[PDB]
Amino acid sequence: TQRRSVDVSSPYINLYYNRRHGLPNLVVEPETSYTIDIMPPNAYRGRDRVINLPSKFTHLSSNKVKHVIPAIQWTPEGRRLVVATYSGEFSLWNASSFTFETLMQAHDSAVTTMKYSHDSDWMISGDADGMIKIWQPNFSMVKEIDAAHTESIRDMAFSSNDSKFVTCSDDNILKIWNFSNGKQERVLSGHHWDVKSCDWHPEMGLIASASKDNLVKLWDPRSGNCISSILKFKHTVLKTRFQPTKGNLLMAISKDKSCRVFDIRYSMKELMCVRDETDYMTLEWHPINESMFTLACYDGSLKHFDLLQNLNEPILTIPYAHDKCITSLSYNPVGHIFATAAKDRTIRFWTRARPIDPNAYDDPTYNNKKINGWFFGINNDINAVREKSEFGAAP
């Protein structure tokens, strides 16, 4: 039985044919036959980064038992998406067809964060009991680490070389860990009230933290001393992330309804400060194109930004991407699929726009006309473009 498939193999064949023959990447024209000229996302830089926007809702996914999804994470090669449930289970989902069912029952409490090693050799997952498990790529539990934190783990980030990783929890403490033996290294002390997020610089030895004290701090992993504090957020900073590729930009979202991007190269320079009438919930940098990132809000409404296009407003808004608060975002490493999970117990996949589409920017994700199973035909369609409907509905 045929079904919707999003595979980047043929675009890569075309791209490498163009590269090995010296041919340029021809401009795509607004017609379906020119979809063959849409290169894989890794091939687009500069002004071509607009093609990489995941503006098209391609699939809605859900598990048999509708549990809250605290975190989602693509596999390091992008083959599968790991969906953590509030019951402590791992849900796998193949990227090609968005189809898989079997659970794992990873943790005993709600899994709160998962992170893959830079070398694609390990995964570390926390939970609500402060328990930090270590997994092999085949999901073999190799290290337990029981009392990693007194409270629920919130975030975990690997070092560049992957021998160390930093973890933060509801307890106001960040701990550096030696991955070789699982031992706990120095304690990053400070951060009055709970620390909500942490991140390691992609190449530098540096820790960025977000806490309830309205502070974003920079840490020395070798010494554990805080080296800089950002006194700009007026409420709890929920998330903070470095730019995955180069790390020159640090962005953090706060419950003060403000997103701020800092240029770490020049004295924590304030680049963008966007504000919204709704709370920002989570963020995600684009894995391929720098200066592009996505913000998730409390009313759904995925917002895609571009540092080089607009420093005040998003370049694309999907006002009704999710029916409830969006909890986690995850870009595919290949960059052609965007996965979002919300409190509506659904995982929604997003792909790049097509050269011509009657339902482009009119899907019930763009207008709130979500009547019954409006996504039934979007999920069951073998093709991608589809003919014009009332709004993009289904039976």
Binding site: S159, N161, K164, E203, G205, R222, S267
Partner: peptide, 30 residues
Amino acid sequence: SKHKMFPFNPAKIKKDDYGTVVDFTMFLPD
């Protein structure tokens, strides 16, 4: 006398296990 040529002598970074060792006094917001 030394012949005109584009200089090229980049400084090697320490690059320990925690990452690259950098001057931490460039991160104060000022």
